Amino acid sequence: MQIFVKTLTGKTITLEVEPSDTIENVKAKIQDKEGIPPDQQRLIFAGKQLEDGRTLSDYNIQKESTLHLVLRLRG
Amino acid sequence: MYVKLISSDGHEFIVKREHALTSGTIKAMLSGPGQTNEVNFREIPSHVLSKVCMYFTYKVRYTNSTEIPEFPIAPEIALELLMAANFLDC
Amino acid sequence: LKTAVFNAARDGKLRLLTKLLASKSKEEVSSLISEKTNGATPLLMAARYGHLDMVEFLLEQCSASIEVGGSVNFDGETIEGAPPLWAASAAGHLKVVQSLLNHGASVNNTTLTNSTPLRAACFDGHLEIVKYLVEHKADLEVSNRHGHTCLMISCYKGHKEIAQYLLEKGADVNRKSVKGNTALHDCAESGSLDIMKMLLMYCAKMEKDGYGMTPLLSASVTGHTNIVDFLTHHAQTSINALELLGATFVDKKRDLLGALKYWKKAMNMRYSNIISKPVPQYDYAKEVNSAEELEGLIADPDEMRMQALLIRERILGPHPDTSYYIRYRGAVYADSGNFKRCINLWKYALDMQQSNLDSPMTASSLLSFAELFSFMLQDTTVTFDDLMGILCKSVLEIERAIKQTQCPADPLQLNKALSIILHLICLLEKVPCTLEQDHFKKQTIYRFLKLHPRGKNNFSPLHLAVDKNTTCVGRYPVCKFPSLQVTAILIECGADVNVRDSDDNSPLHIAALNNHPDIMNLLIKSGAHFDATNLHKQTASDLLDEKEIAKNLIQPINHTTLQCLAARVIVNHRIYYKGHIPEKLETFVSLHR
Amino acid sequence: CLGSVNP
Amino acid sequence: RFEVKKWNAVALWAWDIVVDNCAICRNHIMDLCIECQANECTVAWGVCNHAFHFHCISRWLKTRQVCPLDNREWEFQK
Amino acid sequence: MDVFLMIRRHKTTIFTDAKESSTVFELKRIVEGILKRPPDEQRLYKDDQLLDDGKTLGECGFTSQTARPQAPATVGLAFRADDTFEALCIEPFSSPPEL
Amino acid sequence: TSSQKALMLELKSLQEEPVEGFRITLVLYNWEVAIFGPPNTLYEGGYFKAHIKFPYPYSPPTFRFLTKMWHPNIYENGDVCISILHPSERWNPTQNVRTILLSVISLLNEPNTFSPANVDASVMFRKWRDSKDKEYAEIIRKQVSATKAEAEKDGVKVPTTL
Amino acid sequence: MSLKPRVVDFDETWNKLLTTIKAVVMLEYVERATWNDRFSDIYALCVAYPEPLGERLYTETKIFLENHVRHLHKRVLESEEQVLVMYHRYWEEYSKGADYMDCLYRYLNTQFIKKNKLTEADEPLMEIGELALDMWRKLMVEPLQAILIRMLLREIKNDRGGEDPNQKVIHGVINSFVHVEQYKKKFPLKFYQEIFESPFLTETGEYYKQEASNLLQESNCSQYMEKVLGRLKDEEIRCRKYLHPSSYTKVIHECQQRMVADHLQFLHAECHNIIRQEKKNDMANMYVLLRAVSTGLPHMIQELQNHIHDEGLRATSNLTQENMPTLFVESVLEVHGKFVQLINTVLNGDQHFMSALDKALTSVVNYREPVCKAPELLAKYCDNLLKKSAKGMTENEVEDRLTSFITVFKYIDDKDVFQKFYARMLAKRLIHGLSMSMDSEEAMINKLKQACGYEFTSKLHRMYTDMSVSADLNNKFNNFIKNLGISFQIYVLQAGAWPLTQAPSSTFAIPQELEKSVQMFELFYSQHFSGRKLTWLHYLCTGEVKMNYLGKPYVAMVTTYQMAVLLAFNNSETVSYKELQDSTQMNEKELTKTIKSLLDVKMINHDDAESSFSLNMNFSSK
Ligand SMILES: [Zn+2]
Ligand SMILES: [Zn+2]
Ligand SMILES: [Zn+2]
C-alpha cells in the first residue's frame, strides 16, 4: 500500500510500502527520499513513538494514513 | 585695594585684599562694623607676621595646579607659627 | 644531599642508597637518617610504603629514628606525629610491622591524635596485623583524643572478624567516647546488624550519647532499616521508634510510597484505647490525628511533606538534622519555583538555630539567604519586610557574640559576618520603599555602628567598605566593592571616620591604596585629616601610583593649612611642645606627625 | 538541576 | 492570404526546477532575506542535496559548520 | 615668568607682583599707588646699587629662580625731604629668643 | 520583530492544517497553545492549556503549562525539561515549532529516568513501570477529570479518533 | 604681649565685653579699633591655662540675649494697635545685630561649639546666631502670634480694592517667618507652612467662594469667563507682592479649584452650545481655565469630536454625484485643513484633540449606507491622476497632489483591499504602456512604502524591477541571438508578482514562423540563464497584420486568436466551422466570440457546427 509522511521542511511526501516492511525499512526509505540519516529520525503516529525494531502492522497503520517526522529528543 | 597689618613691634605690612581674605579671622574682622584700613594686632611678633604674609601669596598662586615647592619653616619659630595659625585660622 | 637519601627511601630504591651510604661514614650516616624531608624521616617513609628490605637495612645503621613522629599521607589527608610502626600498620605492611617490633619498637607510640598502632590496623581492617599487635602487648582500650576505641572504629568500618577478635581478647564492649558514643552506635551508623548482634552477645548496654541518641535512634537518622527493624522487637527498647524513619525517607530517598508504607503501621498499632499527641504553641500544618483523615495522603505531596517535617521536628527536638532538613525543603521549593513559601521556611529555621548555637553554620544560613536574595532580585518582587527581618536577625548574632566577655572572638567569622552585612546593605540600597521605614533601617544601621565591632586585622566597617578585598560576595553576577552608594549610607549614618586599625591606618589610607578619586573626595568632604601619619611615617597622598590619579585627581594644597605645616617641623625636631601651647593643639600635634 | 548546602 | 509583421508577447518564469526553499529563514529560495528585507546577495549551496540560504548559512556558520539536518561537514563550494 | 618682590622703607613693607619684562617706571607706579607720592621722587635700590630707570628687570637681575614666591627678593626705596637726599635705611625684624 | 511575519505565516499554515494535538488560540509572544490528550495511552481524557514567551532559530522558547503535572521530566512551577531546549544534537537552529510540539507530545509518553527533575514522581513512575502502584493512575484520573470539566466549560472535547 | 596660655580675671573682661556687645545688637556706632581689640579677649578667655572658661561666656551671653528679647517683647506689646510697624524695625535691627555677633564669636564657634552631640537621634549646644534666632522665635511663638496673624489677614482682606497698604512692612513681617536657616534637616519651612499657609488658604477659599456666588448671581457664561480671568490674574500679580515664592502654586490652585469646580455645571451647557456655532473668542477663554480643573476636558473633547463628525458627514455624502471620485478627496482635504487650522489657532496644540479629530475622521471615511466604497474611489483617483495625457496635466503638480492624497490614505481601515485594486491598475498600466513617466511611478511607490511598510509593498517593487530587467534582457537577447521575418519585443514576467496567474485550459495551436521564433528564444534564454520554466500566455500576446490585397491597405493590431483564424483562412478562401475548430484546440465560446467580433466589422462573411465562412472583399475602413 502507500502512506504519507510530512518532512521537517514543510513539504509532504508519500511512500509505497506494504504492511510487512519493518520500521527500519520505513526510516531508510524516508532517508533516501529526503536525505536525513535515521539516527536523527523519529516517527510519530497518533501521538506515539514508532519503535525501529518492529513493523507497520504492529501499530495498525492503514493505507492513506499520515506520519509525522520529528528530530530526536531525550530526558 | 590693599589692607594694612601692624605687628607687635611697630612694623607696617601691606598685602592685597584677596590675598588677606584667605584667613577666616581677617575676613570676620573686616566684615562687620569695621568696614586704607588698618587691622592692628598686639600679640604677634614681626618675624611671624612677615612669614604669614608670605604664606598668603602661596595659596592664591598655586591653587588649582606641578612641581609645588615645599614651604620652608625655620626650627626657631615653629612654636610661634603654630600658635599664630590657630588665632588667624590660616 | 640528604634530600636525596630520603626520596630514595620513600620511592624504595635500595641499590642507590647503599652506594650513597658507602661514600660516607657511620657518624654522619645518622644525620641524613634524621631528616626533615617534607616533614617525615627516611625511616618513616620506608615503613609507610612497605619497603621491608630497606627498612631492615636502615635500622642496622642507626636504630634511633625508630620512634620519631613525622608527616604521612593517607586518603589525601595528612597525619602529623605518626611514628613508623603506626604508619606501617595503617598501610597493611604486615612484615614491616614484624620487623619493626623485632627491633624493639614501642607498640604503644601514637600519633598526635593519640591513635595507637592497634587502632591504625583496625581502620582499613588488617586483621593479621591486629592479631600480631595484640599478641605483642597492644592495649585494647587506648583511644584517640575523642575517646574512639579500637572496637568502636572496627564496628564503624564493618570489620566483623577484627571486632570479634577484639571482643575475644577482652575488649570492653561498653566504652563511651567523650561525646558519649559507644560501639553499639557505630554498628547503628554503618548498618552492621551482624556486629550489633555480636556486641549483644557480650551484654552490650544500649545508651544515649551526648546528643541524647540511642543506637536505635541513630540508625533511624542515618537510614539503616536493618537495625531499626531489628530493634523494634528487642526487649531492651520501650511505634515511636518506627515513625522518624518515615520522615527520614522523605528527607533522603524522597520515596513517597516508601513513607506511605509507614505512618500506617505506625498508626494501626497506635490505635490497636487511644493516645494523643503534643500540641504546638510553616503553612499551619496541624498534623493529622485521625486515621480516617489519614487515608488521603498520596492525593497531594505537600501535605505529606509538611507532615513529615512536623513529626521530625517534634520527636527529634531542636541539632543539625532538623535545621538541615528544613532548609533542604526550602531550597527544593525555591528550585521548583515556589519563591513565596520557599523563603518563609528558612526564617523559622534561622530562629530555631538562634537558640542552641548562641555558629559555623548560622553564617552559612545567612549567606544562603543572601544568595537567594541575589538570585531573586537580579532580574516575584522582593518585599521590604523580609529583607529588614533578615538584617535585624543578622545584627542580633553579632551583638550576642560581642556582648559576652568570656573569650575573644577570632577575627575571621566576624569578617565573614561583616561581609554578609555589607552585601545586605548593598542589596537594600536599590529597593524602592516609602519613608515610614527608611528611618527604621537607618536607625538599625546607627545602632549597629554604635556597637563598635572589629574584624580581620582589627578592621572597621568603613575599612571593609573602602577595601577591594571585601568584594567577596558569592558566585553570582555582581555586588562589586568598593561602591559609592554603600559607603554613602555608612558616613550618612554616623560611622567614625578617623578610626585606626592595627597598622595605624585610616579609611583615607585604604581608599588611597586603591586609587579611587570619588571615595577619597567623599571622605575628605565628610572630614578626615589629609596628613595622617601611619606606623611607618607615611601620609595618605604618598600612597599613589601612575600619573592619571597622581595629577588632576586631588590637589593637596587645598586641604592643607599653615597649622598642619608647622606641626611637621615640631615632630621632626622634637622641640618639647609639652606645656608651651594651648591644650587643644597638643592633640593636633600628636596626630599631625 | 540553588542547593549550595551540605549536611 | 494574410500575413504578419511584428509580434509581441509576455511570459512568466519560476524556478519550477529545484522545487525547494530555505529551511533556516523559512522563505522561498528565490526571495530576499529578512535582514535583507529590512532595507542583491546570492544563494549558497551544499555538498548534500540540500540547498541552503546564504546569509542564514553564514550566520549559523559563525556558530557551527555542518548541515543543520546532517551533522557531518560543510563544503560551501557547489 | 612673573617675579615676586618685597619693598621696604624703614618699618614699612610692601608686597607686590610684576612681570619679568616690566620696566622700573612700571613698578614705580604701583609703588605710587600704594602710598601717594609722585614717581619722580624715588630712588629704588638693590643692595647698594642705584637702579637706572631704563631696565626691564633683565640687567638688574631678579630672575624667576631667585625670587620664588616662598623666598621673595629684597628691594629698598628712599624718598626726599624737598632739599637733599636721604640714605637708604632698613631695620631688621625681631629675632627669635633663643632658638 | 523581523521574524514576526514568518511566525504569523507559520501559525496560519498550522491553524489551517493541524496534525495532532495542536490547538492554538494565539492572542509566538503570547501563544496560548493548547495540548491534547492523545488516546491509546495514559490520561488522554482532557485538553490542557499552555503559554510561550519565545523571545527564534537561536533563542529557544519557554514552554509553560497551566494545570499541574506529575511526571519525572517536568518542573512543578510551570516548566518542562527537554534537551532540545538547551544549546551532540540539541537545539538545531531549524525545525522551529512542529518538531518542538511533536517532541513534547512524544516526551509525555515515556519519561527519562536517567536524569530526573521531580524525583518523587520519578520513583513513583518507576515503581508503576515495574508493576501495581495505582497512585499515578489515581492522580492521572483526577487531573483528567478536571481538564475534561474545563474543556466542557469552554471549547470541544477531543475525540478518540481524530 | 605673647599669645601663650595665660591666667586672667573674668569680671574685668565682661565689664568691657558687655559695653561693645550691647552696641552691636542695637546697631550703634562702635569705634573700629575697639572692634579689633575685642577679638583677642575671646581667644584669651578660651585658652586660660587653669580651668579654661568658655562655658561661662556661653551662659552669660545666653542670659544677655534672653533679657534683651524679653525687654523688646514688652516694649512691642505695649504698642496700642501698632504692632506691625514696630516689629519690622526691631526685626531688622536684631537680624543685623545677630549676623554681626556671629561674626564676632568666630573662635568660640570653631573651637568649642563644634562639640555637640550628632546629626540627630536617627539644653543642646548651638552657635551664637542660631541661639539669637531661637530667642527671637521664643519671643514670637507663644505671644504676638494671634495678633500678628489677625492683622496680616486683615491686611490681605483689605486686599480687595481699598487703599495701598505698606508693602515693605507686610513683606518683611511675612519674611520673618522664613528666617530660620540653620535648621536644615528635611524641614526648613515647617514653621511658615503650618502657621501662615493654613489660615491664609482658608480665608482665600471662603472669600472667593463668596465672590464667585456674587459674580454668578448677575452674569451669563459669556461674561463670567472674562471676570474670572481678570480676578485670577490680579491674584497672581498680588501674590508675588506679599508672600514667599513657594505659595503661588497653592493659592492659584485653591482659587481655581473653588471657582471652577464648584461652578462646573454652568460652563458645560455653554460649551455644548458654542461648539456648534462659531464663538471665535470663547473656546480659548474657556479652555485656558478648564484645562487645569481636575477632569473637565473629556466632555469638551467629546463634543468637538461629535461636531467634526457631523460636519464631515454633511459633505462626504451630501451630493453623491457618482461620476467624479475627486470630489471625495477635495471635500475631506477641505474639512481636515479647516479643523486643523482652527485648533492650532485657538486651542494651542492639545494633542488630545488631534487624537479626537483622527478618531472622528476614521469613522467618517468609512461612511456607509447599510462594503465600504472608499478603496474603490481612492484607487480610481490614483489611476486617473497617472494617465497618458489629458487637457493640461503637468508633472510638477501631480507630485504635490499625491503628497496630499497620502494623508487621506492614512485613515483607511481596509488596508488589504487597496492592494488588490492598485495591483490591478498598475498591471494594466504597465503591460499596456499607458503610463506617463516611470519616474512618477517610482515616486508613488516610494511614498506608499514610506507610509505603510517595507513588506507591505514588495510586490509592486518586484514588478517595477521586472520591467527594468525586461528592458535590459531585450537588448541582451538581441545581441545574443545573432551568433526570422517578424519584429520582436518580449516581456519577461515573474510568477507571484504579477496577479494574472490563471491556470490555462485551452491548447491553442501556434503559427508557423512563431514556432521557429519560440524555439530560438527558448534556447537563447536557457543559455543566458538556467533553472526556470517559461510558460506561454495566449490571451495578452497581440501582434499586427499588414494587408495590401484590397484597394486600401490596412493594419490590424489584433491578438493571436484572429491571426490564427486568418492563418487558417490562408490556405483556402472558404473555411468551414469544422476546420476552424480543428485548426486549434480551445473552448468553443472563445472561438464563437472571435468569429462574432470578426463579423462585427464584417471583414469575413458567412455563406453553428459546419458553417462555411469566407473572406469578405466588400468591407472597407480607415
Ligand atoms: Zn533563509
Ligand atoms: Zn541576504
Ligand atoms: Zn546535508
Author numbering:
A (entry chain U): 1 to 75
B (entry chain D): 17 to 51, 57 to 86, 88 to 112
C (entry chain H): 3 to 240, 245 to 278, 282 to 290, 296 to 332, 334 to 373, 376 to 396, 404 to 617
D (entry chain F): 442, 450 to 455
E (entry chain R): 21 to 59, 67 to 105
F (entry chain G): 1 to 99
G (entry chain C): 7 to 33, 38 to 65, 68 to 99, 111 to 154, 157 to 187
H (entry chain A): 1 to 122, 134 to 381, 384 to 496, 503 to 626, 633 to 647
Please give the exact wording used by the authors of the publication that reports this structure.
Cullin-RING ubiquitin ligases (CRLs) comprise one of the most important cellular regulatory systems. The scaffolding module contains an elongated cullin-family (or “CUL”) protein that on one end connects to the substrate receptor and, on the other, to a RING domain-containing RBX-family protein. A CRL’s E3 ligase activity is controlled by linkage of the ubiquitin-like protein NEDD8 to the cullin subunit. Here, using a combination of biochemical, cell biological, and structural approaches, we unexpectedly discovered that the UCEs catalyzing the crucial first step of ubiquitin-mediated regulation—priming of substrate—differ between CUL1- and CUL2-based CRLs.
